[PDB]
Symmetry: D2
Subunit: 427 residues, 4 copies
Amino acid sequence: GMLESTKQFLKKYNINDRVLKLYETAMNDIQNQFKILDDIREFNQLKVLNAFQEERISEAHFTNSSGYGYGDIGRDSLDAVYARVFNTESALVRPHFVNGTHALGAALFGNLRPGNTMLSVCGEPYDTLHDVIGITENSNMGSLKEFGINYKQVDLKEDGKPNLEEIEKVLKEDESITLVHIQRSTGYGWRRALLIEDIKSIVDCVKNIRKDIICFVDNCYGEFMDTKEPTDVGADLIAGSLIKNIGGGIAPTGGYLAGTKDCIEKTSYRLTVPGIGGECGSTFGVVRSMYQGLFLAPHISMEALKGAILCSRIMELAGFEVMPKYDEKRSDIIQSIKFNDKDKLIEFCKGIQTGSPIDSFVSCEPWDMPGYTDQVIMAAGAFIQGSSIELSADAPIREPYIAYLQGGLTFDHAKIGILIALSRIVK
Amino acid sequence: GMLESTKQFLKKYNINDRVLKLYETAMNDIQNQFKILDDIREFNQLKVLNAFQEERISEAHFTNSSGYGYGDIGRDSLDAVYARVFNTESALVRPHFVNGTHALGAALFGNLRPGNTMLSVCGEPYDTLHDVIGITENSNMGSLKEFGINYKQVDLKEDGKPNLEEIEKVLKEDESITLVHIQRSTGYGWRRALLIEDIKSIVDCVKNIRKDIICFVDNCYGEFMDTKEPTDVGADLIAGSLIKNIGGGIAPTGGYLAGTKDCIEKTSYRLTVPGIGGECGSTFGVVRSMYQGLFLAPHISMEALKGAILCSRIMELAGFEVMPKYDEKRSDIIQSIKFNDKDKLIEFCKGIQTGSPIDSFVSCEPWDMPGYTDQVIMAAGAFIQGSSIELSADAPIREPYIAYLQGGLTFDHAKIGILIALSRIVK
Amino acid sequence: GMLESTKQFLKKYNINDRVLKLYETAMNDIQNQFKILDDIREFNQLKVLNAFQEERISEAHFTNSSGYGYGDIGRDSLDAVYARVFNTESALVRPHFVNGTHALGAALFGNLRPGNTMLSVCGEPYDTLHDVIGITENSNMGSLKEFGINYKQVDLKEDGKPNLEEIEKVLKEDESITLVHIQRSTWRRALLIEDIKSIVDCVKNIRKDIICFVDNCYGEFMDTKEPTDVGADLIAGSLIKNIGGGIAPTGGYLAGTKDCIEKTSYRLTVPGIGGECGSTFGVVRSMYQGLFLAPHISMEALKGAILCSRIMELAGFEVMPKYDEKRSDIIQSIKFNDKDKLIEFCKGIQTGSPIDSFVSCEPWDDQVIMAAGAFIQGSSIELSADAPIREPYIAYLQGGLTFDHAKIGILIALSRIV
Amino acid sequence: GMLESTKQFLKKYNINDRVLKLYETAMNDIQNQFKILDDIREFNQLKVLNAFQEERISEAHFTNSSGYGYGDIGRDSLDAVYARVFNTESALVRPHFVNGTHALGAALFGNLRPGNTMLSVCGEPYDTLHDVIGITENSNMGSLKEFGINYKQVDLKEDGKPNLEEIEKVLKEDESITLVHIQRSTGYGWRRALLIEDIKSIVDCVKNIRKDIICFVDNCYGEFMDTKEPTDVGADLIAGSLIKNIGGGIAPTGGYLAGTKDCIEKTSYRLTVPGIGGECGSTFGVVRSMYQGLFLAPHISMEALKGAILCSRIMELAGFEVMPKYDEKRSDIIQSIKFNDKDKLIEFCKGIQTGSPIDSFVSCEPWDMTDQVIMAAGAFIQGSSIELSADAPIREPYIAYLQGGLTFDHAKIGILIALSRIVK
């Protein structure tokens, strides 16, 4: 078990016996869940490895392109590797995407035209996607609604599963709907994340009514959570962020997209412009960090998930409501905790920040973040700015006072942050 | 005068006395015009220096942001410096623009909504912008025509200056026109250059009919060509590429935009997505090269211009029609050369290619463009791939075989390149 | 347990049930040894984390670094973070070291003046360090012998432990010896932390002014302690190994007393400047990030070496170190007693590599064959293998960014034997 | 001539009519000198352009190596390009060199062994090179003297030219002398520059007594200053800094060495260690800036030199003694100005700092490191001497040393801003 040197070192951070004993109890109760993740990870490592070996990757693929970047073998082979990993025709892996929202927004504006209608089957989508769609306060910024692209919505059932009966009615009753949006990660809510098994039901259901409907899945945080991905259950196009899971903590920035050749090309013309698409775009000498990041993604993703499981159990034992539980199948690295107390929520976040490698001394304060309606606090003591694959904790300041912990480059680091944070709220 | 050891060295490149004496006559005739560029350059150097100083630029501004890039002082202050240089409210300089076309498109999509008409007042815009507007094919890529944005056009008069009479009639007859497009650079045309004086006429004219119209100006190849810029004569928004003039030969990639805060913000929502705009976007640690590139821009631009002026005169004394002439006011760094022969055009390009630092050995033959009928021969060999500010040439194979030389980091390099090319035709 | 989909996927790499059944047994046997590594790793991750926090590392430390690099906060703080991790006074972490041999040699030339004798207490040192010292066959390159710095040697005892009796006789009978060279990495038992202390106390007792230098390659984060925690005056190592965590693109490091580190920097640079100049080339974040992942990534390679040791013993080969032995490095050796089995093994490791999988793996030019396919060129922290072709045909496997990757490459290689 | 807008803009920087009129005269006088620089630059651009072409450089040479970096074609072809530029057998151009001093130090430790003697024929060498050699102070840092390598010195004559008669006698009397150090740049001495013509005289002289002697020349600031380089007049080895002339204001860091294969190989073993040498070493993806910097070096070097010529003339007309003069043949881009007043020296440096693109707001003042010094530094590349900058130790007769200017226009904008704080 934990060495006596380690115990004594933790005392410097004021990690009391209550928290340390509470940690050891949690660590025992969650050991069986860990071995299920390792044999999943094993497949994913071989899945990525195979993708490299088929595309015939070499030292020559770590390009330092400049200008237009015509004939960039590193950039093109990286797209091909992603296509093989997600088992899709094409893929658009680029550092030019400022964040995950840009990648998601690119897919929508790329695959939607004036007259077409959109349909989010998992209720209100990620809060930063509202202005892109133009659901609420529609300013003259150039949203989907402002370009004649309509938006309908169907919420999930009370239990959390997708309301298939209602999805069929809406599609049948509105033939203009050409794209169906499927958010995988729960986001800032209180429900369990949709499994691959849950996505297959939504895809089979909508594809049965009309086969030409595009199934777009917001795949952030769900990378390598299961042996299969949404693209392996009929998903026409997915999208995500390189500073999260798939980047493995190495990827400096960017986003990715994987799907049918037509869906990816249409998305590339939004990223750039019609006629160019993905033809131009230098990699800024960071292509190797993206390759190596993908290779470590299956491993790093599970380290953060293990920290998420530990967090769930230790916090439950402490007496706080947790979502998801330690023994439930997880479709993402996010671990939400409901404190029902504002003091405890901020102290917990400040504790995660203080247990980080970068900007430890910096104190977390609710920040008026872009895209989010309410003022959201975040604990982002990371090498790469705002990475959620690295240990981090954020929460919108609103009742119920729910904190959202995720990440951990190594399980040991994630673990330490949890002990430091928990000690700061319970003496 | 040229040293005896220099012209002896030049003989190794098959440079003959006929071309060499023809050079000495041209070099003497353009001395007065070179003096005019020097004092214009003198102002632009001080105009750029002042921009840095007013923004208190420091080594702290050479950032190396990652992930989102919130608070990237380098990025933000570089935008501020561009705003000062071009005397505009705001600016949007990013390494994320794959090329100049991306920048120009970003402005169009960002400032045009369904129902709005567009109007090019300098005739047909350059080839790779047709797909963005949707003039030629419009094959479901997401062109302006496919988003309900119409395109209109008014050609230039016989003399080369804008047809202001027809511009008024077109604006008066169609109130839907909210944006007017102005291409400063000549491109593949045999006409007099469009000067700032001429641009002021276009703005004053269209702004007189209806002030709410946006006067967008394609500023490619025209940066620091005159003490004033289009933004100094009322232009609401301008756009260009960083691998041309303004990058000063150092800029690795990217593009820029400068204008009113409204146009820039609206353009940024196309670059990324509505709700984010330019609030995110890491600079990959290449912001220093963009600052230094700008600082060297006024100087490097005139090295290329001086090379074009020398090219114009020496080729005119050689018996070939040239456009523009050596002593005409210029809008861009391009120089056209009408050979009236396929072989003379081919030999000149091969000569330019053979006088380049990178890829001199490479075979320079004509090749077939993927979406055009006529073949194209091109002379390219730069540090930054496809940089136009570096010595380069291009020409479509068709009567009367007009070549387009452009760029040169140092006038000497342009001079050496021209002498190698002309000595290959004139024995 | 391995999913049905995984073993069906592995069939594509010719992996049979002989090897797969042999693996299950090998995996079950080494679980207790893996648990000992996990809690050793737990302390090291905390040790590195505390080093960053005490030094107040921030986003500002990853800023631009050009020219001379005077007052480079990113560089100086990285040295300070290393000094804390190794509990030393100062440190010299620079990306300018071409490799480990540069770092090790920089320490020797830095702390040796004409007349001084050197003493390797672990037999002949690393093969590439012979010309640096100028032991034999000297051309005018500027070796230690050519600058008037002498060299002596003392081999290890037959059992593997250091000969403390012979070390005393040599130091007592030769007062010119001012430095003791202690190579940590290892066909024999690896030199552990406790053994290193036994060598330091033995030499420091006779004459305290003697500087104990320890070549710490591959030994980073193998134990909760380091050579510097047991009285070592200075250590050196390559950043493309254990301590770089697979991310560090190049460089080397040094950690020890302020006098030894400053004296070493004047060789790296020149007397008068030393470490005062040297920009980080915009790759300092990877050196920090690499150090943070080092404790974790190092044990992935070690776990792969433990699996490699057990699975080959069960397969019918002589292995060294054995699966249940305390380790001083991530290296795992395998005696084959056959030329084809050795070649086929490396042939297979090359196939299991992410980079250059397709590339041919045959003996270069006695004679040697190598399996390399890493993101960083020649980084032994990533799955690699090398072996000289000569009886009993011993192989040397090292690395693996993740245990799953090491496991796969090791599994593919054995599948060619059976 | 200068436009009304330009001079109306300069008035915002407090530039008076006296200074501006003084500039017009100075600019008129130095016209012919600028033409002499333009026809030297022309040859240098062609010399470099050819080197790239002879080496068959391409987009594949902009490598991004890692780890050891074996087979790094970009690094090897860069050396070969430099070798062709300097007409030498071998070359060693690396970003690994912390600075020019480290390049020089590597050359000395690399070619000298215990028992050998070193000889500087240009007097006392560059101040920071003392600790490397171990001339005066010898703390146990590992100087040349501390590794049994001796040092001797022969000063220049009163006129500034090398004392050839003493050089001969000194070499004949001590056969242990195997290396002859030669500093090209004038440094901080108020004397005439050492030309390639004068460097040839030193080589021919020392080689006649004993051809075995290695002629080493510290080539800092002399790159592309003339059509011929020290290696073209018999120099066995040379060394310089990439953040000075030869990097064209683009090279981020590093240093170079050009000379015989035996010299360059021996030096690389000091840079690294014996056995490895230059065989290992990743270029950090900055090899493009080094190529590109070399290609702009011939042009950028003369932009700084022209600013120095302009400085020398306008300051002479302003009533201050200068060195070198505007019409003299130069060996470096450094221009010294005698003020005979503490305030006038300080105000001049403050104005240059004001005219910098970076750290313009940073008010420079006296600071100690023998006695106090004031420095004007504001560059993109930290401490780049090719960018406009100035330094001056605070003591009589108060001499300032101005260097650099990426473009001549920027150089003159800094000078006019500085001179306007001192005169009328």
